[PDB]
Design a protein around this ligand. Structure first.
Ligand SMILES: [Zn+2]
Lengths: 304, 291, 304, 291, 178
């Protein structure tokens, strides 16, 4: 497992890119990063980065106004940004369905009014609210149809056909199709999680992944930003920094033992927050090639 | 998910062909546990089963055995019902098991128990038994094989006649009552589960081999479609053959007359006859000891 | 509405004849009667009268032994009798299904082993137990499939088809077929109820009919035996008899006002119980042509 | 069931053409009540509706009206949702209703109330209103028709312009402010429900008829796609036309300037302008009386 | 660390109140006729009621709950809910401990952007805590180089729980535990 997102950044088949991470763990950053890396690596395909965060993180990350109307980020003719408001208890799945169905209407609407078509969309999942809850209802209720359809086959079908397997066939058809919307092919859809080496973060991460696994949604990418690696930076000293990383190293080992076959890309900590297309691309380069605190130390103390 | 499982499965069997058994086993289980935690049983089942296969193929009974148990646990956790697919997975794993595996019997029991809980068979699925029987026989667990074969399929019946025939042949000093000790097992066991077809076929195959090897004095007696290979030096075999047909008539009189003529045999198979008399003649009165 | 069962007795299309009436109201009698009237009126069709009453009412009504094996009643080569035992809480409909499915296996089994085929079967419903409860589950559960199928159509089918109306069609197909087994055509299936002019009987009748209507099962025949008509019999007198009919006349009017468009055939009371093929046919003649206590008085005081 | 319903329906309409109204009504209801008791709503609905149709066609408002109510009761008992079929039944019955039926309004109210409870329209289904409006107008219930048409379909809009046009014409002594009393209703009502399309179309049809009948002095002013039929003898109509477009801009300044130029009109339509200023200009401050 | 071990801090009041709905209603028209065929019930209920509510309320002067957290998103989320849970138990809560604080704008030996940036984030949330829990005892504890262990280093660090920690003067005590 290469601690990078290369295989994904260079993938031309993927058309659904999920990006989650509750806890103000730099979700917005990772989202713009993964979107830029894929757009630059595949200039022969249109990409769309959409967020639902009411704070308009994408507009504050790039430095330009993004609305419900998809707009190409200035300087790139391959990447586009979208900031919509996904809102402007009896049956499970319904509510979630309405929410997602609405965001997709905002997608097809921006592909008709210039933009034409985006080959792969970068979903910047909301900060809170399991917007992927409906990723299980369709399989759930359906399987219930199967228990319903079969059982409704009293002794027979000898006598059931005298008073009346189209039911056992159409069920299986409505079955696969459905399971094909959640499974949505691991080569076509994937989910990228973001976090940091900290107790609470791991807790939030561990559950997030479980949730997705119950959705059968492919997950094999865990981003961990804010890492110190304070044992290599050319300008040592500062116990305060060394102590903090000693704690981050503790958990990081729990992450490398918890997710052994996962793409755990460890990102470096930057002095200030990274904003602007420029500082973003230079920081996202580490998502393609591992960050080496021994040599790439310059690039970091550069964004500062 | 489907494209991810397939991939990792190679990096697993890669750690196995490399020697990294611990790595291969530890990684797979933790990952498998994850699927189970999310109730994605189906995924875990294929992963676990596949992992167990490779381990057993690499002569790693330790890991192989462990995974089998883990698979079964899920089987009961996913309430996997007994059917072709469900049985097939276990049959494929049983084939790679080493007849000397210190867990053999345990593995077998677990699988069969599962078949019992998720099927209408009080003792487990027939087909499954056919495989289990052969495995037990490979570890010289004859008595255990006999039982399973008895409750197996048509092939089991053949492997049960071979199990009894290869045993009879193993006897250095054969005697008139020796051939009965083996042959009788076929007649009684099958008659208990009321499988007249198997009782007749197992009988024919065993009696014909006995004639082509020992060359005993006999003469086939035919009457109204039925045949009784009358052996001139094996009364035990004659009695046993008549007992079979008698049960088929379910007529009290015939059962009593047959026993009264063979008083000795009636005391040797006391308990056995008592049962047959209850299952085929509705007799509640115990069996009065002749001797 | 002709107060008779003529239209049904002479019908060659009907192949499912129901006959119910809890309360020891002479159900067995009416059953054998309706079966004989149809068999004699249509000698070019095989009829089968089957009962589930553990008292073997058909064997005591004709005077011969009837078992699970259909046997032609002696003297008739058009009518056949069948007496089977329909038995030898979580999901509604199941139990009933198993019970009916079994009786139908006993029907097809007697049409292969001589008898070949019965054009119309006369179902002598059991005395107790709603053996027609499953006559609603099939429509019930199915309609639930429709609420299930439709709702499972989140916004779209624009996006539902991008991730995966075969479901809206096959449902409607599995729908009709099902509804065709309950409806079973009013020209192919009907239900005949039996009772008497007495409080408790009416109570039992009223509910029975409601139950059948909820099954959409056609019902338009109500048999009322044991009637006195003690104001016409040639040999008047006997207050005891006149008083009893004054009460029966009271309720009979509630029946003619409760079931205005129903076939309310009023049968006469016989001295003793009617048994034997002979006395049965002569009494069943009133099911084809109304009974007139002024002229048919002889036929009754004859069965005595 | 399906073959039985059809049949009886003839013996019912047979009792109606024979004069036996009581018999026909009594029998049908009791029978219908039976279907309802068994929750066989659908059956009762067709029976009741059909019975009501025949009664109304036979000029029997009494029975006809009664059945309509009964149908509605079931509609609410079966929770019949508002859709084409559901509405159609009522529309077909409303067509046979006598404009003078003493229950008319009640019948109408009942139907509409049902549409409100089983639809997302706070005031009832549009299409349904189109039919209801026409019925009310046949009984000279103009004001009631106006409301329904206002909340109706495109055809209603046409029948609303005809209702206002036939009223304006009914006036013997026409004046400059008379034509405004009718025309203004179209502009205000449609602007409240924010139906600019209907507001513009109703305006065009009404202003063109007014020009082809009264032959007033005017001249069409066109600017940036918009047109304003400037009447030389009807200032009220000019103001009203500008008000419409103004609301379309949703610009506070324009709304204030238009009112300040027509101070008199700003006091005649005080309340109306106050509302428009809140729905199109976000004004919370009340309307200061000019006079 | 996990598991709401205080979940049973609501059942006793719950089931009890249900007894009251039960007890009262079971008083059909009367007690005229209910006494002819048979308020000890309306009294003993109220007695079993108070006693119960006295085991949860357990006096705010006798029982209290101290919560601990740090100025970080996830922590606040966990804290906010924890407090809600306790309030539903009617359990007194007015103390929120926030350790690991930097106060890197006072320590005598400034520098280190890495440390200044982290506290800029901790200061962000800390303000949400001072506005979320206005009438709560929000004691802000200082961050120590390594973890504090041993009776000695513990008492010297716990002194700040009695007297507020001043990063301008108490800086010594901290760089001391190091
Ligand atoms: Zn530092």
């Amino acid at each position: 497992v290469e601690p990078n997102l290369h295989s994904l950044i260079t993938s031309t088949t993927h058309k659904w890119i999920f990006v989650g991470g509750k806890g103000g763990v730099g979700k917005t950053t990772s989202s713009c990063s993964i979107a830029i890396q894929m757009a630059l690596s595949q200039p022969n395909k249109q990409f769309l980065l959409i967020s639902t965060d009411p704070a308009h993180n994408l507009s504050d990350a790039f430095g330009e106004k993004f609305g419900k109307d998809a707009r190409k980020v200035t300087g790139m003719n391959n990447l586009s940004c979208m900031e919509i408001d996904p809102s402007a208890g009896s049956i499970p799945g319904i509510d979630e369905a309405l929410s997602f169905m609405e965001v997709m209407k905002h997608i097809k609407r921006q592909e008709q009014g210039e933009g034409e078509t985006f080959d792969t969309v970068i979903f910047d999942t909301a900060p809170t609210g399991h917007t992927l809850r409906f990723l299980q209802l369709p399989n759930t209720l359906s399987k219930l149809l199967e228990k319903f359809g079969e059982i409704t086959n009293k002794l027979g079908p000898m006598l059931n056909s005298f008073m009346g397997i189209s039911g056992k066939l159409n069920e299986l058809k409505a079955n696969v199709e459905t399971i094909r919307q959640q499974f949505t092919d691991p080569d076509l859809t994937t989910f990228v999680c973001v976090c940091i080496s900290e107790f609470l973060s791991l807790y939030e991460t561990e559950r997030l992944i479980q949730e997705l696994i119950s959705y059968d949604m492919d997950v094999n990418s865990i981003i961990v930003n804010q890492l110190l690696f304070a044992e290599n930076d050319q300008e040592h000293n500062c116990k305060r920094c060394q102590a903090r990383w000693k704690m981050q190293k503790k958990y990081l080992d729990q992450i490398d033992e918890l997710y052994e076959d996962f793409h755990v890309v460890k990102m470096p900590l930057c002095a200030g927050e990274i904003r602007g297309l420029n500082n973003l691309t230079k920081f996202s380069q580490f998502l393609n090639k591992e960050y080496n605190p021994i040599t790439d130390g310059k690039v970091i103390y550069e964004l500062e | 998910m489907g494209a991810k499982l397939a991939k990792t499965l190679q990096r697993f069997e890669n750690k196995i062909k490399a020697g990294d058994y611990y790595e291969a086993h530890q990684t797979l289980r933790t990952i498998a546990n994850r699927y189970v935690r999310s109730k994605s049983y189906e995924h875990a089942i294929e992963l676990i089963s596949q992992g167990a296969l490779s381990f057993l193929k690499a002569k790693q009974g330790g890991s192989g055995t462990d995974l089998i148990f883990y698979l079964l646990e899920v089987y009961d956790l996913a309430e996997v019902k007994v059917d072709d697919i469900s049985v097939a997975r276990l049959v494929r794993l049983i084939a790679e098991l080493d007849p000397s595996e210190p867990n053999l019997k345990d593995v077998i029991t677990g699988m069969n128990n599962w078949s019992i809980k998720f099927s209408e068979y009080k003792f487990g699925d027939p087909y499954l038994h056919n495989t289990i029987g052969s495995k037990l026989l490979e570890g010289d667990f004859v008595y255990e094989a006999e039982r399973y074969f008895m409750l197996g399929t048509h092939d089991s019946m053949i492997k049960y006649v071979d199990l009894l025939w290869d045993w009879l042949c193993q006897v250095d000093d054969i005697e008139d009552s020796t051939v009965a000790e083996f042959f009788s097992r076929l007649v009684f066991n099958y008659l208990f589960i009321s499988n007249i077809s198997f009782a007749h076929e197992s009988k024919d195959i065993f009696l014909e081999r006995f004639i082509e090897k020992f060359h005993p004095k006999y003469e086939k007696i035919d009457k109204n479609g039925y045949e009784i290979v009358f052996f001139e030096d094996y009364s035990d075999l004659n009695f046993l053959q008549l007992l079979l047909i008698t049960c088929q008539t379910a007529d009290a009189s015939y059962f009593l007359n047959l026993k009264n003529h063979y008083l000795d045999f009636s005391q040797a198979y006391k308990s056995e006859l008592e049962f047959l008399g209850q299952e085929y003649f509705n007799i509640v009165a115990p069996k009065q000891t002749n001797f």
